[PDB]
Design a protein around this ligand. Structure first.
Ligand SMILES: *[C@@H]1O[C@H](CO)[C@@H](O[C@@H]2O[C@H](CO)[C@@H](O)[C@H](O)[C@H]2NC(C)=O)[C@H](O)[C@H]1NC(C)=O
Lengths: 49, 48
């Protein structure tokens, strides 16, 4: 209506939880051990990559 | 003669003539068990 307004007569204090990711697990790969295991022969072929 | 092989996870029935060495545990070694060969450290195990 062009001539009426609603005013809050009261209030509520609210506490709200916002959860945010900030980091992830730091990961490391031994690329030689993953590809070749311990085999010397494969490690020599891997050098060619 | 046609020799047909199978190389299963089952007891070795025919083997090549390789001489066999003592176990060397707790060291990184080359190994060859029934032709299954690799490199690593051998230890006792609990495995069933
Ligand atoms: C807003 O509403 C709350 C209730 O929802 C009012 O608090 C009540 O106030 C009466 C009278 O003061 C008490 O008898 C009640 O016990 C109160 N309840 C609670 C939960 O506090 C509050 O007064 C209102 N705020 C304003 C500014 O009027």
């Amino acid at each position: 209506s062009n001539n009426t307004i609603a005013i809050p007569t009261n209030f509520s204090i609210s506490v709200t939880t916002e959860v945010m990711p900030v980091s992830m697990a730091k990961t490391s790969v031994d690329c030689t051990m993953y590809i070749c295991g311990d085999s010397t022969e494969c490690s020599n072929l891997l050098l060619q990559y | 003669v046609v020799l047909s092989f199978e190389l299963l996870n089952a007891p070795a029935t025919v083997c090549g003539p390789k001489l066999s060495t003592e176990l060397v545990k707790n060291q990184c070694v080359n190994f060859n068990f029934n032709g299954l060969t690799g490199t690593g450290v051998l230890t006792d195990s609990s495995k069933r």
